[PDB]
Design an enzyme around this catalytic site. Structure first.
Site, short mmCIF file in Angstrom:
data_model
loop_
_atom_site.label_atom_id
_atom_site.label_comp_id
_atom_site.label_asym_id
_atom_site.label_seq_id
_atom_site.Cartn_x
_atom_site.Cartn_y
_atom_site.Cartn_z
N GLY B 305 0.82 -1.20 0.00
CA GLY B 305 0.00 0.00 0.00
C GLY B 305 0.85 1.25 0.00
O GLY B 305 1.41 1.64 -1.03
N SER B 308 3.21 5.90 -1.66
CA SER B 308 3.20 6.14 -3.09
C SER B 308 2.42 5.12 -3.89
O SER B 308 2.32 5.27 -5.11
CB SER B 308 4.63 6.21 -3.61
N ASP B 344 1.31 -7.56 5.66
CA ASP B 344 0.26 -6.65 6.07
C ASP B 344 -0.05 -5.69 4.94
O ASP B 344 0.47 -5.78 3.83
CB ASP B 344 0.68 -5.93 7.35
N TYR B 349 -4.99 6.50 4.07
CA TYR B 349 -5.90 7.65 4.07
C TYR B 349 -7.36 7.24 4.13
O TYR B 349 -8.04 7.16 3.11
CB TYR B 349 -5.61 8.54 2.87
N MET B 421 3.43 5.81 12.43
CA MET B 421 4.51 6.59 11.85
C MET B 421 4.87 7.70 12.82
O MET B 421 4.01 8.47 13.25
CB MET B 421 4.17 7.14 10.46
N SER B 422 6.11 7.71 13.26
CA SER B 422 6.54 8.62 14.30
C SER B 422 7.50 9.67 13.76
O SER B 422 8.33 10.19 14.50
CB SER B 422 7.20 7.84 15.44
N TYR B 423 7.39 9.97 12.48
CA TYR B 423 8.41 10.78 11.83
C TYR B 423 7.81 11.67 10.76
O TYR B 423 6.63 11.58 10.42
CB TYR B 423 9.49 9.87 11.25
N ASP B 424 8.66 12.56 10.26
CA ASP B 424 8.35 13.53 9.21
C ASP B 424 7.15 14.40 9.53
O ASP B 424 6.48 14.89 8.63
CB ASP B 424 8.16 12.82 7.87
#
Lengths: 83, 631, 27
Positions: B305, B308, B344, B349, B421-424
Site C-alpha cells: 500500500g 506512493s 500486512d 488515508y 509513523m513517528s516521523y516527518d
C-alpha cells in the site's frame, strides 16, 4: 603435579586419588529439609558448587580453604590442581 | 553475559558491610564501580552506570538521564583541602579514537568532485551528496536473549539495490545511487525480531509509477497461458521487480552462482516461489536459516500500500469480489512463500491525505473497516492456527483521520497491531515553521498541537485512554534521516520556504549515515558535532537538532540519545513493540541504542563499539512552541 | 609405556536437526 608421576611415587592408582578428590561425577548431595544459615549460595555470582568439597567430604585435605586441589586440564597429560 | 568485578580494602580491624570506596574529587568518572566522588563539597554517588559527560553537580538529584546522582554533604573543609574540590568542568572529545567508525568511498569523493554535484561538507557548492552507503561500518554489538522485552523490527526497501558507481556510472543520480548488501546484518543476525519489506502493490493502481504495474501485468498475462494458469485482473498483487528480488547476487549476500539475473517480468513467473527464489528474497530465507541456527526466529514480513502506491485503495473499495480476488492473491502468495511470518497492508488515508492521487471519499474508512474484517475472515479460513498470521496497519497520527480509521472495529475484527509513523511531522518543504518531525513528547503550551508540535503521545493517549486499546496492539519506531531547512531562525522557527535543503539524494531529508560522515562524530568517545556544524538540543520538547549559520540551515533529527529517550519511554510504557522505519541507512548504532532504550542487554564484555558517550546532550536551548511564539 | 587417555565421554550428545544449516561444513 603430574598425576601419573604422583601416582607412580604413590605406588597407587590415580583413580583412587580422583575419588579422594571426588572429582568424578559422584558430586556431593544434601537433603532438602535443611537450610543452612548465612546462605551466600545460589546467587548468579555464587558460582561455587554446593556443598563445597573444601566444605564437605574431604575438607581436611585442604586448609578449609576455597582453592581445594582437583584434577585440572591435561597439559603434558592430565594434571593436578596446585602445590 | 557481560560481567565485571571490583574490590575494596580496609584495615584488618574494620569491616564495612557497604562497599567502601576511596573518597576523591569528581573527575570524569565512568563505568560500574562504586563512586562517592566529591564536588562542590558535596559527595555524589551515581547508583547507575557512569558516563564521562554526566556531572554530579547537576547530578545531586539528576546526573543521569533518568534519576538522581544522589548525594550527601559529609565532606568537611579539610576534606575539601586534602582533595581539591571540583566546582566546574566540561568533558571534551578525547584526542585518540577508541574505535574506527567508517571507510571512505572513492566513488563518493568522485561524486563530490562531479561538476554537477560539486558537493562540499558545508553544502555551499553542492546541496546534495548522493553518498554511497558503502561508506558505512558494521556497528552492531551483541546481546542477551532478553525474551520479556517488546519485539524489535525494521523496515526494508528496494533502494538497497543499486549505485551504478559500482558500475562506473557518474552522470545521473542513480548512477550515484544507494544500496547495501544484507550481508551486513547477516554477519550478526537476529538484530531484530521482525522485518518488513516496503509496500508493494496490485494491478490497477493509479499513481505515477503505474506503468510498472502495466508492464508486470503484461508479463504476467503473457506468461499465464503458457503456464496454463488463469489470467488476472485488477486487485491482484504485484511483486514490483522480481529481477531485483531474485535476479540478483550482488547486495544479496549470495554467490552469483545460479543468479540468472537475465530472467525478468516476462520470464520470472515459474520462479515466483520461495523454493526457486534466488536473489534478495531467497537470501532472506537463508538469513532466517542462520538465525534459527542460533534460535530466536525473526518475524519475516512485509506489507503493501503505502505513501506512493495507496492510490487504488479507494478504487478497490466496495468492489467486494475483486477485493476477494486480491486477498486470494494474498493467500496465494502465502502459499508461494510460506516462509513468511506475516505480511500486512499499508492503507494510508481513510480520509484523504498525502498524495492527491489517492482519490478518496468519506465512506472509505467504513468500507476499509468492512473489507478489513473480510480479509481477517479469509485469512482465518486459509490458515492453520498452529501457523496463524496476525495483521497490522500503520497509522498517520492525523488527530482526526486516525479516529476516522475506526480502530475500534478493526480490533473487534482481529486486526492485531498498529504501527504509528513517528516521523516527518515537519513537512519541511511546505510547513509553516521549523519543528521536530518526530517528537514523541508534548512541548509546553499544547494550545497549538494540531498541525504542529505533534507529540505522538497525544494519539497514544487517544488510543489507550480515549480508545481503550491495549499497548500490545500498537507499535512505535524511529527513522534514520532528519529534516533540513534553509534560513531558519532558532528564535522564531520561521525559515526559508521553498529554498532547497540538504539531502544526499533527497533535499530536505538529510541521511543519517552521511550526517555521521559529514556533520557529527563520535571517534573521540562523545557525541561530537563537527566541521563547524552546531550540535544542539531543546529542553521544551526534549528535541534534538543541528544547525549551520552560513546558510541558516537547520536539521531536526533523532540521535542515539534521542532514540534512547524514545525506547526508554516505550519500555516504561511496555508498548506492544518497537521498530525502525528506513532501517536501510543506519550503521546499527541506533539499533544498539534501541536495544538500550528497550533495556535490551548486551551479552558480553566485548563490543563492536561503545555507545554510552553517544548520549551526551547537544547545545542546550529552550525553543518556544509555535503557539508560544505566535502568542 | 601404556600412555592412556580419558573416557569417550558423553559431553552432551545433542538432539538437533540435520542440515548444513545445522550440521556444519565449516566452509
Amino acid at each position: 603435579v603430574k598425576l601419573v608421576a604422583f601416582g607412580d611415587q604413590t605406588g597407587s592408582k590415580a583413580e583412587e586419588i580422583e575419588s579422594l578428590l571426588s572429582c568424578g561425577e559422584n558430586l556431593p548431595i544434601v537433603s532438602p529439609n535443611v537450610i543452612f544459615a548465612n546462605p551466600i549460595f545460589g546467587s548468579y555470582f555464587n558460582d561455587e558448587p554446593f556443598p563445597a568439597p573444601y566444605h564437605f567430604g574431604g575438607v581436611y585435605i585442604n586448609a578449609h580453604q576455597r582453592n581445594a586441589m582437583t584434577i585440572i586440564r591435561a597439559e603434558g597429560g592430565r594434571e593436578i590442581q596446585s602445590l | 553475559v557481560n560481567k565485571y568485578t571490583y574490590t575494596s580494602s580496609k584495615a584488618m580491624s574494620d569491616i564495612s558491610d557497604v562497599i567502601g570506596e576511596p573518597l576523591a574529587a569528581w573527575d570524569s568518572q565512568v563505568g560500574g564501580r562504586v563512586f562517592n566522588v566529591i564536588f562542590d563539597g558535596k559527595v555524589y554517588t551515581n547508583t547507575y552506570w557512569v558516563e564521562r559527560w554526566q556531572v554530579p553537580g547537576i547530578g545531586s538529584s539528576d546526573g543521569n538521564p533518568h534519576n538522581a546522582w544522589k548525594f550527601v554533604r559529609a565532606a568537611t573543609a579539610d576534606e575539601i583541602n586534602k582533595i581539591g574540590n571540583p566546582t566546574t568542568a566540561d568533558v571534551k572529545p578525547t584526542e585518540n579514537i577508541p574505535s574506527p567508525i567508517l571507510v571512505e568511498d572513492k566513488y563518493t569523493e568522485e561524486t563530490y568532485s562531479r561538476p554537477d554535484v560539486n558537493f562540499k561538507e558545508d553544502g555551499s557548492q553542492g546541496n546534495l551528496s548522493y553518498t554511497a552507503t558503502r561508506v558505512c561500518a558494521p556497528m552492531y554489538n551483541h546481546y542477551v536473549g532478553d525474551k520479556t522485552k517488546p519485539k524489535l523490527s525494521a523496515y526494508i526497501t528496494d533502494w538497497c539495490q543499486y549505485d551504478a558507481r559500482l558500475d562506473g556510472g557518474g552522470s545521473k543520480e542513480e548512477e550515484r545511487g544507494r544500496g547495501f548488501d544484507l550481508a551486513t546484518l547477516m554477519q550478526n543476525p537476529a538484530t531484530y525480531d521482525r522485518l518488513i519489506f516496503s509496500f508493494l502493490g496490485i494491478c490497477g493502481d493509479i499513481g505515477n509509477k503505474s506503468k510498472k504495474v502495466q508492464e508486470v501485468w503484461d508479463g504476467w498475462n503473457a506468461q499465464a497461458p503458457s503456464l496454463g494458469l488463469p489470467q488476472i485482473g485488477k486487485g491482484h498483487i504485484v511483486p514490483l521487480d522480481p529481477y531485483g528480488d531474485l535476479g540478483t547476487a550482488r547486495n544479496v549476500g549470495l554467490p552469483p552462482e545460479s543468479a540468472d539475473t537475465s530472467i525478468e517480468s516476462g520470464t520470472f513467473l515459474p520462479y515466483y516461489q520461495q523454493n526457486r527464489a534466488a536473489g534478495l528474497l531467497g537470501g532472506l530465507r537463508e538469513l532466517q536459516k542462520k538465525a534459527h541456527a542460533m534460535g530466536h526466529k525473526l518475524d519475516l514480513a512485509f506489507s503493501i500500500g503505502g505513501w506512493s502506491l495507496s492510490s487504488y485503495f479507494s478504487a478497490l473499495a466496495e468492489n467486494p469480489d475483486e477485493r476477494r480476488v486480491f486477498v486470494a492473491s494474498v493467500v496465494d502468495f502465502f502459499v508461494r512463500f510460506p516462509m513468511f511470518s506475516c505480511v500486512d497492508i499499508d492503507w494510508e488515508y481513510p480520509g484523504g491525505g498525502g498524495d492527491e492521487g489517492n482519490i478518496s471519499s468519506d465512506k472509505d474508512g467504513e468500507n476499509y473497516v468492512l473489507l478489513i474484517k473480510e480479509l481477517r475472515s479469509a485469512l482465518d479460513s486459509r490458515f492453520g492456527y498452529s501457523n496463524r498470521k496476525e495483521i497490522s496497519i500503520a497509522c498517520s497520527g492525523v488527530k482526526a483521520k486516525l479516529k476516522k480509521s475506526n480502530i475500534d472495529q478493526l480490533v473487534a475484527n482481529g486486526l492485531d497491531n498498529i504501527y504509528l509513523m513517528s516521523y516527518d511531522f515537519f513537512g519541511t518543504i511546505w510547513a509553516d515553521y521549523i519543528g521536530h518531525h518526530t517528537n514523541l513528547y508534548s512541548p509546553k503550551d499544547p494550545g497549538e498541537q494540531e498541525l504542529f508540535d505533534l507529540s505522538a503521545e497525544a494519539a497514544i493517549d487517544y488510543l489507550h485512554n480515549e480508545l481503550g486499546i491495549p499497548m500490545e496492539k500498537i507499535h512505535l519506531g524511529y527513522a534514520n534521516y532528519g529534516r533540513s531547512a534553509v534560513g531558519g531562525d532558532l528564535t522564531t522557527r520561521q525559515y526559508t520556504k521553498n529554498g532547497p535543503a540538504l539531502g544526499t539524494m533527497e533535499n530536505g531529508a538529510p541521511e543519517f549515515f552521511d550526517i555521521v560522515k559529514n556533520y557529527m562524530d563520535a571517534e573521540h568517545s562523545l557525541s561530537m558535532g563537527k566541521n563547524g556544524f552546531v550540535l544542539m538540543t531543546d529542553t521544551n520538547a526534549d528535541a534534538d537538532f543541528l544547525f549551520s549559520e552560513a546558510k541558516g540551515h537547520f536539521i531536526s533529527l533523532d540521535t542515539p540519545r534521542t532514540v534512547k529517550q524514545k525506547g526508554e519511554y516505550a519500555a516504561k510504557n511496555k508498548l506492544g513493540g518497537v521498530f525502525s522505519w528506513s532501517g536501510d541507512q543506519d550503521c546499527g548504532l541506533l539499533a544498539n541504542a534501541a536495544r538500550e532504550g528497550l533495556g535490551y542487554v548486551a551479552d558480553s564484555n566485548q563490543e563492536t563499539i561503545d555507545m554510552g558517550p553517544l548520549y551526551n546532550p547537544g547545545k542546550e536551548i529552550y525553543l518556544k512552541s509555535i503557539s508560544e511564539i505566535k502568542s | 609405556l601404556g600412555r592412556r587417555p580419558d573416557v569417550q565421554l558423553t559431553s552432551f550428545w545433542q538432539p538437533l536437526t540435520l542440515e548444513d544449516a545445522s550440521y556444519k561444513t565449516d566452509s
